[PDB]
Amino acid sequence: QLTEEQIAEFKEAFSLFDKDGDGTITTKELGTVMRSLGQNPTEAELQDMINEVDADGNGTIDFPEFLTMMARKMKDTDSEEEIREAFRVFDKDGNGYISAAELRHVMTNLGEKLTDEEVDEMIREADIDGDGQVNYEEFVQMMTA
Amino acid sequence: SAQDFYENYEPKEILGRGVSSVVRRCIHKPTSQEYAVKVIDVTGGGSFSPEEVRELREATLKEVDILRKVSGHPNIIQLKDTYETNTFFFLVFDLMKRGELFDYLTEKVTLSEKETRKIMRALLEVICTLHKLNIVHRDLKPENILLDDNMNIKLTDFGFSCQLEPGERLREVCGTPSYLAPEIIECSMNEDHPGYGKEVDMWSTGVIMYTLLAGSPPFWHRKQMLMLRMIMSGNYQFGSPEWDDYSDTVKDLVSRFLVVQPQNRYTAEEALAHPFFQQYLVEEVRHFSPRGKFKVIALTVLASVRIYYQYRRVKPVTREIVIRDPYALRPLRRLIDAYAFRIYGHWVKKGQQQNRAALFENTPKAVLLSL
Amino acid sequence: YKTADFGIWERGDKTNQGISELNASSVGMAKAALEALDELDLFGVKGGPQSVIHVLADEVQHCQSILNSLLPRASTSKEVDASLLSVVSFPAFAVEDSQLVELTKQEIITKLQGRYGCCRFLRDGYKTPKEDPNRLYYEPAELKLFENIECEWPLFWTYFILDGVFSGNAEQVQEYKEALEAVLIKGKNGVPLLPELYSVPPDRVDEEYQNPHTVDRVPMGKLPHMWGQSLYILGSLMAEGFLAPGEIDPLNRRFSTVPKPDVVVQVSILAETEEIKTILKDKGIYVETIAEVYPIRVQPARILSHIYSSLGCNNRMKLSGRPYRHMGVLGTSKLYDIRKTIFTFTPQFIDQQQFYLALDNKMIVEMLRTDLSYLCSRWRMTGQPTITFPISHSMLDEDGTSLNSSILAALRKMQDGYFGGARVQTGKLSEFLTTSCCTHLSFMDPEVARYLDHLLA
Amino acid sequence: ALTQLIDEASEGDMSISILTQEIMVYLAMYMRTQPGLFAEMFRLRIGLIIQVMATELAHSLRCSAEEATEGLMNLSPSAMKNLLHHILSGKEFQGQWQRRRRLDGALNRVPVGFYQKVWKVLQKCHGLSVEGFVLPSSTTREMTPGEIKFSVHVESVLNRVPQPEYRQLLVEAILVLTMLADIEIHSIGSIIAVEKIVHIANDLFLQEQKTLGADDTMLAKDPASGICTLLYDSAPSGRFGTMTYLSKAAATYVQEFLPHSICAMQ
Ligand SMILES: C/C=C(\C)CC/C=C(\C)CCC=C(C)C
């Protein structure tokens, strides 16, 4: 039921996770990402974290494995918390509105260089209510979509 | 002749046993390469009447045929050559140092998601080759599945297989009871149903999924016919606490093979197209609309946040949770299953009265003794 | 193989309490000695059949069944003994599976060798300073006192040197030569002396308890150890090109580890009466009757056991010959030349007077199936084994006119050339006269002789 | 001497004397050809082998023990050999697991390395008591884990329960301490009664079925052991398995002896 699209979205997310084109995401790589997004967990934490997802995998997450997590295993509460968390991860300001520049802040963090207008467009494409901001309601509506 | 057998191979040790067929390891003298030989006693110690003696040969003569129709394929054994005598029928094939999947499933009670994926990835890709050549197996049990030192699946015992004429559907009941598709029994209990086709293998493969990931058959109970009504009706449950820890992508693909109606079953070609068996090919452009990019970056965040959240959730093992409910949480439940199969792993064998589900009690005694 | 003994260390089990145990050293040593003495002329080339020692391969290969089961252990009480080096490599060569030899040798390596030799066996305490030299026996609690501080004997390092010369591992003959040269105690006019053992100083026992095989040991015991000193010189002689493995092993025991191909077991199905020959003929079985085989005459396995009771008889020395022991296929599958009459003996599992295991025809096939399997993988004689299988009235059906299906399947199974994992060349007993182990029983050449005298006549 | 020992151990009954040596051939027959059936039995107890072979031929073609005793004399050597292989190999022709626990604790069949696992547990304890017969930790230093003399000591304590089915309950009870011992960092430092862990596990097996709807009829007590007959018939694993209740009662006993516990490595 995950569409060709959805599977593809999970795949590009897996790409954003691994800088090396390893075909795997290492404990170190995840880390580079979490710190990229500002959550700096213990190298040990990471080991456990990659372990919870894989259990064999020697500290590397794989994509077939990755999708397994990104498929909505999440409970409404569980996802809700998460959906919320990302949203915060999105707003360093924590103002509660998604800056076009804030989107850039995240990408810049994930090392993807994308056009400035395109970014505005990214929000604009998805933006009706928040002209220039994606409201959280927009975010949740969007994720399910 | 037997001289032709010993001019090329020399049997060293006994590898396995069967009802009338014995698997024996051999050395190929010209090549010094390890090979397995299955040694079927045609006369069967005198118990076989001339009909069964003839029928076993015709079954064996047919058996060479299918194994001669499929060759060079990575995940089915290669019948290197076959020798027939008046009292035996020798078949030499590849040596699999490790035993059947049943023996492996006994060692590891619950087989992990990563391991089963390539296991069946081969099996489904095995199933594609059989269906493309139009040959059904009707016998896809894990004891029919052999594994090598790299864990690669070698589907074995196409003893019950038969090539359907284009658009023909069989009626004979061939197969041990648990792994029989619903219309197998229905054709056994009715004449109107004109038969079953190549979709039979899909149900049997989907059964391995429930057995490998949970250590029990989807439908099992100690009397014979009761299992059958669970099959044709199709009452299966991803029961708790066992089946809740696995990812949701597992469940849907299990139901697809387990649908009772054959035409709606999930054929092998599209079976490999379900999200589980999708593979990460590094060199993909993967172009996306600006909404598509925004999801990816959001999903990339949503993933990282998720992984931290899921882990934070795992409850360390404490004294109390052991007292209240051991099975409920994964690490202790997998342990109880593991030391369940170390004590009574000899009590699991092939058949109905020796299946793995006999080692699991997932229902209250009262409901078990309700009728 | 069936006798418990104190063994190479004269103390029996690990406990040292007068309990004899089945040590692999004794079982292995007897197997090599039996093979060494097998058809050996004690007078040399200028000898005759009177001077030949006759050895039965039943007892030789029974020792193998114990060696394969015991190894890499030395006994049920010892996980390993360094004396197994005297069985796996030299001078016994009693193990035929090279994997067993390497596995047992490496087990000795991990569990016994240190930097002063090899311990005889775990928890030895023969001269450990934690045992009283007055008590001949050891109490059960004292065994744990000997852990990791056991005396170490360079004797077993001479065995590894000897193994390397025989195996042909120049590296092995070097690592154990420099290791032995650093433990050899110089004495008299500079000659090297092999210490019997290296013992832990009493003060340093606690240190080796914690950190194993590192404390400096003092040479104790016999100086020189005349046993170990000889193999040191023997190893030195064969390592510097003064002697070859074949000259010290003229009986070629060193080739015991080379693979042996399985033998083709010849089987001559026989009929006790003419009327049984017709039932077999009606089923298409080509057999000779018991009388048609004459001059070759068949006898029960017991008769062969009685015959060997006259081998080694010396009235003045009060020797009564071989005791009555059960004869397996390896003994009864030979062709026997007693007083110029060729003798074939029925295998023992068909003997019906002893027990009731021969009265179940489904058991005859099962015993026969394993007994051919025992024959093909464990035949070490000239010629091919010949099992003479007489079909008796008991092996027929209850009706009496048909052969029992289990035996019926067994007989055709042999004609096709494979039964029980063995290659069976079915034929007549006359055809197998020239392709069998024709052992001349010279002690019968001028009780059982009186019976055989009438039997010949 | 070996034959004399069998005849004297035949206590005068001639039928058992032959069956003792007859089975001995078959045990050696299967040992030489299939060594894997004795990997879980370190002591070959022929004498009870006739008894355990009697019960399965008693339950099959349901009849009295005396009729089975007359029946056991009656089978062919091949049938007798097959039926013994039927016993040893684990192939099945009161209850299902009650017949798989009266055939698992009467042969003293224990998993591979269980005698090598008791050694690890006893080093974390002061002993292991069964029916008030202690197997102290002093044995751990006295014999090695792989010493067969140690296997006798663990075995000798485990036959202090006469009934076979309860012994296997003790056997897997021992292992649920082994698996809980690995998780627990601290040591109990005192005696553990392996028998009791089954008893409250019997008691705790009682409560859950009462709550879920079990009648007093189905949960009927075993007259001698004190265990419910359903607990004997219960499967090993599962939500309501025997070793889930024994993984449950192997913690309340450590509650009283160990006031504070730390469980790690999951
Ligand atoms: C993590 C375990 C939690 C409840 C069970 C309690 C564990 C024990 C009470 C002691 C048994 C074994 C010890 C080996 C050292």
Numbering used by the authors:
A (entry chain D): 4 to 148
B (entry chain C): 12 to 382
C (entry chain A): 176 to 621, 659 to 669
D (entry chain A): 875 to 967, 1051 to 1223
Question: Please, what does the article write about this entry?
Answer:
Phosphorylase kinase (PhK) phosphorylates GP and transforms it from the inactive b form to the active a form to initiate this important biochemical process. The 1.3-megadalton PhK α4β4γ4δ4 hexadecamer consists of a tetramer of tetramer, wherein four αβγδ modules are connected by the central β4 scaffold. The α-subunit serves as a bridge between the β-subunit and the γδ subcomplex, and facilitates the γ-subunit to adopt an autoinhibited state. The γ-subunit bears the catalytic activity and consists of an N-terminal kinase domain (KD) and a C-terminal regulatory domain (CRD).
Local refinements were further performed for the αβγδ and γδ subcomplexes that display good densities, resulting in 2.8 Å and 3.1 Å reconstructions, respectively. The γ-subunit features a KD that can be further divided into the N- and C-lobes, and a CRD that contains five helices (αJ–αN). Notably, Leu78γ, Leu90γ, His148γ, and Phe169γ line up and form an intact “regulatory spine”, demonstrating that the KD adopts an active conformation. The CRD wraps around the kinase C-lobe. The αJ helix interacts with the δ-subunit/calmodulin whereas the remaining CRD (referred to as autoinhibitory domain or AID hereafter) loops back and inserts between the C-lobe and α-subunit. In the KD, N-lobe residues Phe16γ, Tyr17γ, Pro22γ, Arg35γ, Phe99γ, and Phe101γ together accommodate Tyr593α in D2α; whereas Asp52γ forms an ion pair with Lys588α. Importantly, the AID also binds to the kinase C-lobe. Thus, the AID would inhibit the KD activity by competitively blocking the binding of the substrate.
